Amino acid sequence: MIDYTAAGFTLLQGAHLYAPEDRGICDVLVANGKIIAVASNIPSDIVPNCTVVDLSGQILCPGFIDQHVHLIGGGGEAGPTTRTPEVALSRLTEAGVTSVVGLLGTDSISRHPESLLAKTRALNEEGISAWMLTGAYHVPSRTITGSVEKDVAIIDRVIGVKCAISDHRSAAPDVYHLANMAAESRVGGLLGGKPGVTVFHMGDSKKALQPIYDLLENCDVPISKLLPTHVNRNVPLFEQALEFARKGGTIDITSSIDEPVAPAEGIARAVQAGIPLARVTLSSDGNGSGVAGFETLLETVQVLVKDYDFSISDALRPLTSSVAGFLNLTGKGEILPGNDADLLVMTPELRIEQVYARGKLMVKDGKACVKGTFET
């Protein structure tokens, strides 16, 4: 018998597929970590050495893309005992996260972009998909190569730059500094084939988004590259964010911020305000500092469907297609032929059962079956 095991053929059968678009009962054929066919009634024997998975009665959807994770650990605002630990592979996978964007925050003294890059690469070797943002709250940014533009252009895993504004922990950046940094990210992305975004950690200053508007007034970076995050942290800020989105920007809601605007609520409000889901993303801020977890992501989807009247498809957008679109994550956020085989298998009540990353089974019966090198 010929050995075709190198293909890793996997047929996911009979689940109710949400691509996120509802596709009804539809099958998914995978080979080499890629989605090679998406159709009803794919023959269990279409390909050899095929692992057939009966997903009857289950739900199938794209894996989550969490664009705001402190991969190497964060914290440190109350001294060194508050530096959090690096993230564990299984914590991500059990949470349904198959793609991540790592970043740094307040501390860029004991935290380094080179370290973040190494962890990013470890995660990719481990089976998931990971990118990072150069910089940290500090402006001017602390980079790997000496320039934001050069980092985004030449460090493969770097997709944009991080910063903090309107926050008591900011570097008190002026418009010129912010604009130049964003412009550099933009240009570096073009060169490197990266989205070249600028992510803004928002604080509670009354100024809110003003720095972003000033920046817009002082440069030609498209508004589509400017991402304010933690927008639900305060009402007045949230309200500004809706306008920002109405103007063409994309806003990022933090699943780990419960009050004063809860995540689901935030997403619900956006839609009420007439903002298309494509301009609304949800991130966890996981692994920050207590120690932020990833459970709030799935919880958010559940709540949206359960308590807010969102369809399953719509509820998924902000964690899947909306993210992939904002970051130009080719091959992610959608179940289509040619895309990466990053999928979630859930109960009808939206409880995760299985997770596939790049076609590999990572979670089974809701428990990780692939663990990081040093996990216990």
Residues 279-298 that bind Zn ion (CB under 5 A): 285, 288
Q: How far is CA 320 from CA 24, 72, 142, 326, 350, in A?
A: 18, 23, 30, 10, 15
Cβ-based neighbours of 71, under 8 Å, separated by 6 or more: 86, 87, 100, 102, 103, 116, 119, 120, 123, 130, 132, 287
Which lies closer to a second copy via its Cβ, residue 16 or residue 186? 186
Location of structure tokens 């959608």: 334
The CB-of-38 to Cl ion minimum distance in angstroms stands at: 31
Which lies closer to Na ion via its Cβ, residue 193 or residue 222? 193
User: Residue 42 binds which one of Cl ion, a second copy, Na ion, none, with CB within 5 to 8 A depending on kind?
Assistant: a second copy
Do residues 169 and 131 make contact, with C-beta atoms less than 8 angstroms apart?
A: no
**Binding span for a second copy by CB under 8 A among 54-62, 163-171, 251-259, 271-279:** 163-171
> Would strands 367-368 and 360-364 be described as parallel, antiparallel, or unpaired?
antiparallel
Q: Please pick, among 107, 252, 285, 314, the residue that the annotation labels catalytic.
A: 285
Q: What is the DSSP string of 295-312?
A: HHHHHHHHHHHHHH---H
Which lies closer to Zn ion via its Cβ, residue 106 or residue 339? 106
Closest CA to 288 of 153, 118, 111: 111
Q: Binding to a second copy by residue 174, rule CB under 8 A?
A: yes
Q: What is the DSSP string of 98-109?
A: EEEEE---S--S
Is 285 designated active site?
Answer: yes
Maximum distance among all Cα pairs of the chain, rounded to whole angstroms? 70
**Binding span for a second copy by CB under 8 A among 115-123, 247-255, 278-286, 302-310:** 115-123
Q: Binding to a second copy by residue 112, rule CB under 8 A?
A: yes
The CB-of-330 to Na ion minimum distance in angstroms stands at: 5
Residues 176-215 that bind Na ion (CB under 5 A): 193
Residues 201-220 that bind Zn ion (CB under 5 A): 201
Q: Binding to a second copy by residue 367, rule CB under 8 A?
A: no
The CB-of-8 to Cl ion minimum distance in angstroms stands at: 23
Region of 172 on the Ramachandran plot (φ > 0 left; ψ -120 to 50 alpha; else beta): left
Annotated binding-site positions: 68, 70, 75-77, 106, 137, 162, 169, 201, 230, 233, 285, 289
Q: Would you please indicate which residues are annotated as catalytic (active-site) residues?
A: 285
